[PDB]
Amino acid sequence: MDVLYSLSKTLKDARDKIVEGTLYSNVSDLIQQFNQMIITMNGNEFQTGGIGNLPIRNWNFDFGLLGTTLLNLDANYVETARNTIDYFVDFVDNVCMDEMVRESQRNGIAPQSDSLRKLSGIKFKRINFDNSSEYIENWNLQNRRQRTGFTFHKPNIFPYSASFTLNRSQPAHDNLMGTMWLNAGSEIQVAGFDYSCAINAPANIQQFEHIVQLRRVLTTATITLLPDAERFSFPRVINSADGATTWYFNPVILRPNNVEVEFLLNGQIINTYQARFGTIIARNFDTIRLSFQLMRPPNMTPAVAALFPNAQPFEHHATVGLTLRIESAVCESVLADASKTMLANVTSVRQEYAIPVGPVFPPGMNWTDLITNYSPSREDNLQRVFTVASIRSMLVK
Amino acid sequence: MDVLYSLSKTLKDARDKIVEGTLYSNVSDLIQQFNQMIITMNGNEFQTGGIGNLPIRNWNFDFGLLGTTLLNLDANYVETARNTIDYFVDFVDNVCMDEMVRESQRNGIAPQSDSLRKLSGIKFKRINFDNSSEYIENWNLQNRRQRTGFTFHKPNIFPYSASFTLNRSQPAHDNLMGTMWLNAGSEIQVAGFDYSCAINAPANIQQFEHIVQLRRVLTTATITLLPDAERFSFPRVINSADGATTWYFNPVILRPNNVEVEFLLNGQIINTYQARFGTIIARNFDTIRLSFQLMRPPNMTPAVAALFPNAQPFEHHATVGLTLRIESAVCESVLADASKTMLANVTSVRQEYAIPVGPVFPPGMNWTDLITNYSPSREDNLQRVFTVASIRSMLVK
Amino acid sequence: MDVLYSLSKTLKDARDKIVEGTLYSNVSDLIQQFNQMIITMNGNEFQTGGIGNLPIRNWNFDFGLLGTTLLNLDANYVETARNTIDYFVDFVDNVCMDEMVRESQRNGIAPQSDSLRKLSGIKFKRINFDNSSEYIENWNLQNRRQRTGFTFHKPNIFPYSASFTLNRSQPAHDNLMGTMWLNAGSEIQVAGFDYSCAINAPANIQQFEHIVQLRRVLTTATITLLPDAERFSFPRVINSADGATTWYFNPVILRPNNVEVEFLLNGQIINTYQARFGTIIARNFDTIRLSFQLMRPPNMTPAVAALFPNAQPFEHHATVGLTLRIESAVCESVLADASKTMLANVTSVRQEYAIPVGPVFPPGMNWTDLITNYSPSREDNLQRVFTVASIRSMLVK
Amino acid sequence: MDVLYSLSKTLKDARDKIVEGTLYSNVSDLIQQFNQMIITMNGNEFQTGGIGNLPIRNWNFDFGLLGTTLLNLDANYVETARNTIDYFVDFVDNVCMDEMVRESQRNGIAPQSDSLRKLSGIKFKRINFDNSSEYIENWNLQNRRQRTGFTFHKPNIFPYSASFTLNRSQPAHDNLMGTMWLNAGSEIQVAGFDYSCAINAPANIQQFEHIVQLRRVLTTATITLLPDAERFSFPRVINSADGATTWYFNPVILRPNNVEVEFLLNGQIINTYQARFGTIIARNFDTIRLSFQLMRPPNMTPAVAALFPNAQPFEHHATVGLTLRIESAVCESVLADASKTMLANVTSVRQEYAIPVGPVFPPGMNWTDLITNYSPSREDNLQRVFTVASIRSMLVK
Amino acid sequence: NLNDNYGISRQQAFNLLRSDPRVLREFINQDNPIIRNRIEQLIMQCRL
Predict the structure, then answer these.
(1) How many CB pairs under 8 A join A and E?
(2) CA-to-CA dists, residue B97 to A81, B52, C270, angstroms
(3) For B142, which of D106, D379, D380 is closest by C-beta distance?
(4) CB of D395 within 8 A of CB of D11?
(5) CA-to-CA distance for D324 and D328, rounded, in angstroms?
(6) Helices in C101-193 by DSSP H: which ranges?
(7) What do you get for the CA distance between the two ends of chain D, in Å?
């Protein structure tokens, strides 16, 4: 993989640096590297493909070196260099498209697309130039196991779950108490709803709790915690658990009081926030515990008193909400984001070349079912395909 | 333009690398480059400006080269280096400010601001150092026409369109059916609404479809699709087609059933997704066809039957919503995003130097009316000004 | 600080470039720099910590140079390289924490964490390699005072503020008029409400103005302005100004007419947008003024005339809302964002090592109370800790 | 493209000048140029075709030069010359037939038909002999951007538009006032009709105006302007606006008084003509305004007074006509005419080889829908296909 | 959608084209949601 990244990087740097009129004193090192790569490659025959609608290609490298005699590059040299580089670029794109599709439950880290196994040999190890990118650096680190981490902007770690939970229900659905939540991508929008507005409750207070359990530990998360959840704040017609009947939901928002957010880890508490909103931080957490309340206003105007009466009809259901969006974060493992096109490239290639479903990745690579079960084999294969996708996308966009 | 980016990059790398105490062994190449630039430049007299409040400036370069015998850099060297770099820096800034305001319908790619044509001459070609940036790389590619790509995070490709469509309407506006949509920035929020909750429609089902057509193809778009559109979910008073009268809209959200989103291209279909929510992908698309339905609940409680009767008043209108955001994407054509400042730089320069309206760009360069007709001429001029804006921003942020 | 950045950069480039099989021609210069670093460090003993849970670690540097007879690299060299680089890496991490966990109101820019005061000596000045990154570039610029700038994506410049202003109030809270606003992170959402629907006003038009002031100037801001705010559009129960009683808010959204957005600067008007929606720009602004109107619909249907009567009950309150998000921006001063992790790493270190609260930063570094009073001392300390935190992140993510 | 034109021109001059009995003194330079062409070509292998029903022909050039040893040309020389020229001609014809069919939005000026991208290289530039023709001269000018010009005889600049405008309508269509116009190719025919002969109008006079806004600017136009538009001078049955019903039209011609023809440019007036008919001129104009009147004859005879009564029937409708043809003209851009076969050759090639419809040109290249939106992309593509069509017509008509 | 996510063999593709009940029921027993959704939609369209 390191040699793949090196090929991609030096091809990028050759398409960038080598232009007519530039100075050999600035590109001598890259030219020596390219010529050494050409030498190491001359005499090998590679085969690529053989799965799904991917064609079967054969590559035979026999090129000529690049002259070190000039001082200012001319077009007759750049043209030859680009004729040489486009073949390598097509070869690398085809290797990456051969490697992103295959899977294995046994040593997923160990390469597939056997041309890449061949390139992992010891006669090709002279091609390595530099491994600076985030994904390749974390690859080399996790191989030489150390405290690693990927940085994410708005990460997609929550699988889409839009559900409710009723702690007091009836067949008529006229006096309910419960909590609703939508956990999706980077956002959690939770809303505790009581139809009685905490009149029969002790101290005119009713509590609600929401426990989210991540599959992989995060770190240094920057979060925005706001009140008045939006998608649980308008009229609704929701179905029962067993789907038998439906029920009406006319919410009216109130502030959550004595709120508490506990970021935990292996059941132990790490961070705790009381009545704070706006921007917050969490240095490490595998679990989030939101705890909020609905407190009946002791004083009330005529309108709100006539809207929260002491009888069963209850045509305005009191609610208390909380939106929580993870803006940035850092994670030892690899996930999806709103910044990088690695997952998109992988999925697009698979959809394009009609790849059969394998033992590791779910059918079609649906991120919901891919993050709801993030077993180490899936994690390794996902890291591998994301890394080679980053590689392929450093050249072909 | 390549020599302008070369100037900017080598000047940035001078300001950064050349600092007191550093080692000549690591900056010899950059110093030879700077001195070759000085040699190429010295003797040439340039002009800049002559449009809007851009003052007309005249540049005359006669500088002295930099030592190369030292081992560690001292103040008596860095000071001269800075006195030489500041001149080129303000020169490049003035050049970019003169080149971001000029337009043309014929050969927008061709440089305006004729001093820049001079720089684009063949005797200045010896300054090129490395074309590493995304913008200049894609520029060189489009010159040497090849498969390009720009990667975008939340791109602004949709213009502001907040409008509805009624498929069954009357002068009284008491039993309507239709679809509303707000398409803005990177998001589409659509909502199909029926006042009679599909009481007369066949099979108690009402269909809704929304076809959005983009002015440029996209690729590898990571998309977040969620139900329960937000901004079409509260009471409203909305004007008529001809703007004469107004009507009321009290929506009640239900669940989308038989939802299907199709990503098409030139009218042919590429990708489709049926009842999949959350994070999805679109590998290549120019059109988005959403199709959803509204299904009357067969079972109903007293409270909801009080809202969905069998008679004409219909004081609660059943709705079904869909939000769809484009988090990331890749595109062969230059656009705006929520990450890059190039558009802001261009518009700020124009606002600051009082540039009258040109023949190509609308007044003030309002992205709405600039993306509502993304003609190739506009695309070329926009890529040009965005490239030189990136270049300027690399020095003066 | 420059020397610390140099250490971090050459150590990163060492972990990256110095791998098995690569060519000595590519890393000769980095190896000369590393050996010079060694030569300059060896013979010095450093102390780090003594505040909170930080142990008082004593570092002694006794390392040998890197051989230069080789042409390519072997694992028997990379191993020693790693066993030598890990020590400098943890030393740099500990120094960065020791500098993140210290404050000063007198010369906040000057180096605390006296090991760093030592590293700032004149004998260590031979280690400066390249001051390339944004933070260190701006550091050196401000030292050599010049027009600086940091580029931000969705910056957290607004402290969390959710409040209201009533221009016509009654003790029964029955016929109100005024404006509510929530200003948080990078977004504002402001909604003008009238319970009388502009029946008693002149010309059936009511005005609404929101004046936002920023505690730091901005430039080249890109903004998205949309109508029909979403978190001020559903039923609400809000509290009185004196917080004794509560009142009820049943809104109905209309369109903003004669909308006017004035971005000013010390009362001097800079940018003015009239009835433009979607993506807009602000070249320089300290103050925002949003001025909109609520105009009664003269042509009304029965369904809406039944909701906007000419009498006191007013069970449906006319509302007009605006959302304004700042997507990108450029600022002479350092802030927080949704893309980068400097604030997260700082707060995580402080919460992990239980640092007491200093005379400058608030308890827990709550960004709201930190951006409220953005004193120049707090600005200097925040710049310093963000720069060293970025440095630390360049090694340990 | 220049090399293609040079090929065609030297092959034309070879088929013309090289004939039995002619004198080497006259064709020495052409023989030198032909030999230089054969040398530049020998060694190259081209491929042409692969779109629609165009066969994919591969061309391989290995020929022998033409001696320069005689004085008078003998048949043994002309025979070889012809057996080479026929091959070169068929090759150039196939190249032109592959270039007349490939479209692109981005860089339409750039060579498509990649064999021609190869010909556009620098080893082929030795073929250029003389770029004398108008099209190639204007091409070289647009490359070396300068003030161009194409001369035209009867330029088809108006799209076919037959349409009326009723400034006074009734449901019965019995008393109408309005104007009809047919704009087609190089001619306009306009007719202002009043059913009441201006009986109720002030001073017994009625005004009529017609403003034509051209899509491209013309210069040095020669125009023939006459009264009594012919094709709107006989009885008619014309449909309504919405196309539902029809109405009769019995024109009776009078003469235009106070006739005023204004050739404008960007709203400014350039040429003004009053009471003049026949040959006129227009030095520059993007817009034409024809303003004529209808003046009731005060002194009428019995036979004519019995036609224009003072009452509602109005069985004879007074008309005033104006014909205006554009005989010759000059345009900075390219158009079609009644004199040049370029457009015909292009459309014939496309119809013959079944070229699909592309993103730029309308189906079948209908000049109406091609001139009604004269996009710069369309202008560039049209100039390119017209130029290569001229080239292919210089060999085979 | 099926050929994209559940990558399909030649025989399965030919039989899906010919609308073969054998392969249709093999998928319905393989628990293919892309097909179960279509079948539930057929039910919701064949209700009345």
Answers:
(1) 23
(2) 35, 11, 19
(3) D106
(4) yes
(5) 12
(6) 115-119, 134-143
(7) 19
